Design a protein around this ligand. Structure first.
Ligand SMILES: [Tb+3]
Ligand SMILES: [Tb+3]
Ligand SMILES: [Tb+3]
Length: 139
């Protein structure tokens, strides 16, 4: 299994592309401020989710929840100063590799059931954090 989540912050828009390269349908929840969007991604399927905000600063702390039907992986991104914090919580019965890609930086962490992992990324240039992407891998 693999669920690919790509984010682009092109403008007043957060685009999220979700690919389910696994054999079970996943439900994906995204929260940014007052707006929550929710989508089923069937096996093989790609879905685009787009938030708008006049003030693009309201996209500071987006949360992603992948549900398999229990089984949830929660991913919170906190853009604070020159740093991007990524907090991964695994609430399933099985470990998950999370591969993270922010500009040049590539980073892989295992997350066992009931573990929370925080990875911090640095930027010389806050435009490094404009197209962050993460993949959750299971079995
Ligand atoms: Tb684009
Ligand atoms: Tb539902
Ligand atoms: Tb469920």
């Amino acid at each position: 299994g693999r669920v690919e989540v790509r984010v682009e912050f092109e403008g007043d828009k957060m685009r999220v592309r979700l690919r389910n390269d696994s054999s079970t349908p996943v439900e994906v929840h995204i929260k940014v401020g007052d707006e929550k969007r929710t989508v089923t991604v069937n096996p093989g399927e790609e879905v685009e989710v787009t938030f708008s905000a006049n003030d693009p600063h309201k996209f500071n702390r987006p949360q992603f929840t992948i549900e398999w039907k229990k089984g949830r992986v929660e991913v919170r991104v906190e853009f604070e100063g020159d740093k991007m914090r990524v907090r991964l919580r695994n609430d399933s019965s099985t470990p998950v590799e999370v591969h993270i890609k922010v500009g040049d930086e590539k980073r892989t962490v295992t997350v066992n059931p009931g573990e929370e992992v925080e990875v911090t990324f640095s930027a010389n240039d806050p435009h490094k954090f404009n197209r962050p992407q993460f993949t959750i891998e299971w079995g």
